Design an enzyme around this catalytic site. Sequence first.
Site: not given
Ligand SMILES: CC(C)(COP(=O)(O)OP(=O)(O)OC[C@H]1O[C@@H](n2cnc3c(N)ncnc32)[C@H](O)[C@@H]1OP(=O)(O)O)[C@@H](O)C(=O)NCCC(=O)NCCSCC(=O)NCCc1c[nH]c2ccccc12
Lengths: 179, 179, 227, 227
Positions: A94, A105, A107, A151
């Site tokens: 929605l 939704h 990221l 976040y």
């Molecule tokens: C996380 C993200 C966007 C960060 O980007 P990046 O890699 O460029 O990061 P930066 O370099 O800018 O920053 C790095 C930081 O990101 C954080 N980080 C990165 N990976 C992490 C991990 N595995 N665990 C904890 N913290 C972590 C850390 O805090 C880390 O800091 P440190 O260096 O100090 O650790 C990027 O790595 C990515 O696209 N990941 C996969 C998709 C995803 O998870 N989307 C977020 C879903 S949360 C939002 C969302 O979409 N919800 C929908 C909900 C949803 C519906 N259906 C689903 C099915 C499955 C899953 C989720 C859903």
Amino acid sequence: SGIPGSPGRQRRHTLPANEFRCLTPEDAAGVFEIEREAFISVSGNCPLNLDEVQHFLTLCPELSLGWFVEGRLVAFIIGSLWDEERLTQESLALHRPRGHSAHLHALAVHRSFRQQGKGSVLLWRYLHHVGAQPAVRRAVLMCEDALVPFYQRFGFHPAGPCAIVVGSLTFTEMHCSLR
Amino acid sequence: SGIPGSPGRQRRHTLPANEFRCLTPEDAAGVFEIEREAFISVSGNCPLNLDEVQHFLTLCPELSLGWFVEGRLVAFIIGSLWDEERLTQESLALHRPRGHSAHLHALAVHRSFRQQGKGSVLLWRYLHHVGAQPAVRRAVLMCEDALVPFYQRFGFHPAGPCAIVVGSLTFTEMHCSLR
Amino acid sequence: DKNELVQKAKLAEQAERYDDMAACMKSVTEQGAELSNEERNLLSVAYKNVVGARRSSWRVVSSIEQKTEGAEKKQQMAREYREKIETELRDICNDVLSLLEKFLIPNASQAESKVFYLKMKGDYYRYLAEVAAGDDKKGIVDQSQQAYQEAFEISKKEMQPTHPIRLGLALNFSVFYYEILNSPEKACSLAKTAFDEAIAELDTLSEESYKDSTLIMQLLRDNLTLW
Amino acid sequence: DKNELVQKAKLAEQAERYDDMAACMKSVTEQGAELSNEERNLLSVAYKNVVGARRSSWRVVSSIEQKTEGAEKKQQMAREYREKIETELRDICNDVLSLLEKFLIPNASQAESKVFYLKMKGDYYRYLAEVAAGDDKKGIVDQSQQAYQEAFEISKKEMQPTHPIRLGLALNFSVFYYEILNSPEKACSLAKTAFDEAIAELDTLSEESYKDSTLIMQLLRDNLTLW
Ligand SMILES: CC(C)(COP(=O)(O)OP(=O)(O)OC[C@H]1O[C@@H](n2cnc3c(N)ncnc32)[C@H](O)[C@@H]1OP(=O)(O)O)[C@@H](O)C(=O)NCCC(=O)NCCSCC(=O)NCCc1c[nH]c2ccccc12
Ligand SMILES: CC(C)(COP(=O)(O)OP(=O)(O)OC[C@H]1O[C@@H](n2cnc3c(N)ncnc32)[C@H](O)[C@@H]1OP(=O)(O)O)[C@@H](O)C(=O)NCCC(=O)NCCSCC(=O)NCCc1c[nH]c2ccccc12
């Protein structure tokens, strides 16, 4: 597209260099391809399927934003407006025009561009982009526990369990005050 | 209004420094004032009276543009859309939403800022501003013979006598192709 | 330190101080090590921004100059300023072109890298061509075309029609034909072929069929619509 | 030549090369002759743009700096870059402040000119105050307040409530109180009084009412709404 001396004429295009843009319905395939890797490969589920992605990009593209590296889409945020304090199951598909909260939704950052700070730059950017819109007073999203501390670095706060269940997955709700 | 770190918050204002903006209905008094000096004092007539000026600024402010010297309005262009090849008497008070020509009703520079090239910068600017709008393919205005050579420097072309009479005044019609 | 330079470079990009960002990436490149894809993007972006600024100022001061009809002196003001800007523009181009010839293209191990830097070489000679005059011009335009052509060559052999780098080259190379060479027909061929082949590969529904380069394709069709 | 400098300055403004525009106006000012209103606007605009750019980069690199998590990891990089920008910012301010003290304020024959340059003096000390480090801060903030206060003084005596320059000072001076002095109440008084007095004069429908300063008034009310 500035052509000094020719007011109504648009200048030809050449390859751009790193930009932030609202996504178009045509960018949907590229989103779902990142979602396959990013979401479907780990949990077997993903936030939005191609149809759902295309929907939001046609209905409310201004609530979306992607980082384009020289013309290549490498990171996105698909959103829509919600009009309640808490997120509900039905809010997944929605968009509430007179809503007040930017519901993120999905990221995701392409695997070859992660850990470069690009996801953070995008998120920050998106909060400013939608925050500027005169009705959007808050931002809401759900994520798994691991991403909660991440976040919080953007102003989001834990709002307990999210009432939305995806497949056999449960998430924590996050709220971020804007205007 | 960028406040790094605070997405929905707008930054406080301090005195700006030379800018081009769409005029608001509140800027009408300043517009009529320049018109008193600029037109009413020579011919005893002027393009638009306060009411008429306010009208266009409320109805179609995006078809207007002013040069603001550090917050002070010193030059303007009030316009609206027209939907015929030639200008007619009735087009003076008309704005045609689905029109294709940007009708420049009035163009004036404050006496203390004339002959500095500022009127030209504004006109050029306005042709780009409105030319960018997807339906505006041409620009139209009427002026007295003396100003004909001036307007040709911007692409306008003599279109013979204008069918519009103001008081006891006749003008030459000018057309400028855009997109 | 290489990291510090990259960190400061990513900082300058956000601070919108591209001249600083370029300086940082110029130093990293000068340590003779092959750049990572990230460092490569950073260098490309720094310079595309640094030069684009001058190119924009150039187009405006040129327009003003040719519109200063009559006023010999007011026109000469624009002439000299434009030349001042051209020197600045020339220096920037020679800078990256030198970096290209000394570190970038020699270190290019993969075809994706070779085409990227070769396209970048065609790019800067093109910018240099936008302001060249005298006999220097005929030479600059050849230099651009030959780098573009070689990249195109490799592109066809090692890259999928939908690859963002292959497609980017298509766009820039067709524009080169259009405005630098005044060859509308060839320019359109380049663009249409590229777009159509990309569409063809996508119409197959392959996970390999990029779908990342949607923008570069919209850009291509827009140019077509334009021409 | 004075004209050439102004011609080139108006050219640089359009070319969006404000550092050049400033250099031109700095030279004109250095010929010791009182600036025309046009030349004055040109100088104000050149510098407001040149410094604004650095101020913006400063705010962003500072935000990034405190946000930076962990230890003195890359926390030290932002710190240094921010300092690099602060030096640049400091130099620009000292530049106009010197110009002000040597030519601008001494040549100010009319009250309108005296308040303009005095406000401009308060402005640059304010920008200097935004990055002021520890002990240097106290002095800078006094310098700003005293120029602003003097201008306000003259403003009340020689200018109508609706004058764009009187009003401009009201805006900047109230913001000075708001963020530099942390005096919300006084800041709001300054702004509200100025707005109300302007509204009052406009209300009598007199011929001397300005209506040229509508924007500066909207700006003032927006700030009020904000605070
Ligand atoms: C996380 C993200 C966007 C960060 O980007 P990046 O890699 O460029 O990061 P930066 O370099 O800018 O920053 C790095 C930081 O990101 C954080 N980080 C990165 N990976 C992490 C991990 N595995 N665990 C904890 N913290 C972590 C850390 O805090 C880390 O800091 P440190 O260096 O100090 O650790 C990027 O790595 C990515 O696209 N990941 C996969 C998709 C995803 O998870 N989307 C977020 C879903 S949360 C939002 C969302 O979409 N919800 C929908 C909900 C949803 C519906 N259906 C689903 C099915 C499955 C899953 C989720 C859903
Ligand atoms: C003319 C303008 C806008 C130029 O600005 P500026 O002073 O900043 O000029 P620049 O410095 O940019 O350029 C200077 C150039 O402007 C031209 N120019 C300036 N004054 C001129 C003059 N007296 N005769 C011939 N050419 C002249 C010259 O070609 C001159 O070049 P030279 O240096 O080479 O001479 C500015 O000076 C101004 O606001 N003037 C008064 C109002 C006005 O006339 N609006 C135009 C009505 S024509 C459009 C319009 O509004 N139609 C409504 C029609 C209308 C309805 N009712 C009326 C009642 C009375 C009169 C008109 C109407």
